[PDB]
């Protein structure tokens, strides 16, 4: 229902494409920033 405005949606496209720890399942990782 939302249109893609090339002047207003860029900040949103940036953050939703930001690298995040999505592969931290059953991993022994020293640092995980308060995931949930």
């Amino acid at each position: 229902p939302l249109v893609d405005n090339p002047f207003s949606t860029y900040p949103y496209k940036h953050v939703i494409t930001e690298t995040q720890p999505t592969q931290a399942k059953n991993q022994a990782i020293w640092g995980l920033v308060q995931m949930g």
Partner: protein, 435 residues
């Protein structure tokens, strides 16, 4: 008895009861999703005190966040009437962000404006109890104050923050505390010796969902329609005599805006939106030989007498053209909130709506300032020629003149309330439309 009218069924009443769809007296209530509500304390990162800025990270205790209330403990330094909403002027502002991305921000002046404009009836009186001393309490008195926050998710459970689905971007609130609080550590410009520092704690009301709903929140994407407050401060100037000045303020707003609201205030005395005068409740000592019109009788700072107001008329323009013909300020203070809200607005606070029912959250008409290249608010002021110390003129002059003390209402605060969309996908989210 009642059968005497029940049998008296006719022709034109077919539009009321012909082939009924509903019956009023057997109401079926809907079955809901199991949840529990709990309110717990958040810790504050930083030193709490006057003029300090601290932040709170909201812990991941529940599934959804709804009400957040900031509790402050204050000791007054003055007598009854020397305070005027201490709790919310101390709460200078609150900035809301998700993962470092700004969602919204509210200012102490807005909290006063919103309380003055949209909160109504005894609810507002209760609010006063939550933020002020209302029983003529004296020097040394201690009271615990509660300042509820009014972000888009704070007034309705339907817009609560989906923590389940906001795994990678934490929710934070930054709290700026005022350096000066009237009646607590300052009395006018004078410091109050020995005034204590505020103690503050942030309470967050969590909702806990049951098993299937939690799963649904965790796996499905979400689209929430949310509000934003747009603001920056402006400067104005009202002449003393011989003229009614005009001013053209260039507005810098974007997004579907459902109303604009603004006020004219004295930057030193928090919440003063009108001129002070030697009439009851309009200044310190009003009505007695000691009456002085430069200092308010603070606990009564808010008034409904628009002759103490500075604004004469206002007009909103879009791209160089008038939106409506110029109307006098009293329309925007008394009639628009009657049409759009239903309550009463004190003098000096003005509203113009683009929506039919901006008080509610269901969208009801917007002006999208993202397609407007030049939005201008044009003001005409009253001539400040009434001698504020003479009730003969303050309670008896023409509509185009205001008090000489109105020349101190030099801070122009213009607010815009708009829609944006908070969209959550794969454990994170943010607002779809920036500018």
């Amino acid at each position: 008895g009642g059968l005497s009218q029940l049998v008296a069924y006719g022709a034109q009443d077919v539009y009321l009861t012909g082939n009924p769809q509903i019956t009023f007296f057997k109401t079926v209530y809907r079955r809901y999703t199991n949840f529990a509500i709990e309110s717990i304390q958040q810790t504050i990162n930083g030193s709490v005190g006057f003029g300090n800025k601290v932040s709170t990270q909201i812990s991941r205790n529940g599934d959804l966040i709804t009400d957040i209330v900031v509790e402050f403990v204050l000791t007054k330094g003055g007598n009854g009437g020397t305070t005027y909403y201490p709790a919310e002027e101390l709460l200078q502002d609150v900035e809301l962000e998700i993962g470092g991305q700004r969602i919204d921000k509210h200012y102490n002046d807005w909290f006063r404006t919103y309380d003055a404009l949209f909160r109504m009836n005894d609810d507002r009186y209760n609010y006063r109890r939550m933020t002020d001393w209302v029983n003529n309490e004296l020097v040394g008195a201690q009271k615990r104050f509660y300042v509820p926050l009014i972000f888009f998710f704070n007034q309705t459970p339907g817009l609560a923050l989906p923590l389940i689905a906001l795994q990678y971007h934490e929710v934070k609130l930054y709290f700026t505390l005022a350096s000066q609080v009237q009646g607590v550590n300052y009395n006018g410009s004078s410091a109050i010796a020995g005034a204590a520092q505020p103690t503050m704690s942030v309470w967050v009301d969590y909702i806990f969902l049951d098993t299937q709903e939690r799963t649904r929140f965790a796996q499905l994407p979400h689209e929430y329609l949310i509000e934003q407050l747009q603001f920056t401060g402006s400067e104005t100037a009202t002449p003393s005599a011989t003229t009614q000045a005009s001013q053209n303020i260039r507005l810098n707003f974007n997004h579907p805006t459902k109303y604009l609201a603004w006020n004219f205030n004295n930057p030193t005395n928090y919440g003063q939106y009108t001129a002070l005068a030697n009439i009851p409740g309009a200044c310190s000592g009003a009505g007695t030989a000691a009456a002085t019109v430069t200092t308010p009788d603070y606990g009564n700072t808010g008034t409904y007498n628009e002759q103490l107001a500075v604004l004469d008329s206002a007009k909103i323009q879009l791209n160089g053209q008038d939106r409506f013909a110029t109307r006098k300020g009293s329309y925007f203070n008394k009639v628009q909130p009657y049409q759009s809200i239903g309550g009463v607005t004190p003098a000096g606070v003005y509203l113009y709506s683009f929506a039919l029912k901006p008080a509610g959250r269901q969208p009801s008409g917007t002006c999208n300032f993202s397609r407007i290249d030049n939005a201008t608010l044009s003001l005409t002021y009253k001539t400040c020629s009434i001698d504020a110390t003479s009730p003969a003129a303050v309670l008896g002059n023409t509509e185009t003149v205001t008090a000489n003390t109105a020349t101190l209402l030099t801070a122009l605060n213009i607010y815009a309330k708009n829609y944006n969309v908070l969209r959550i996908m794969s454990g994170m989210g943010g607002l779809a439309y920036a500018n």
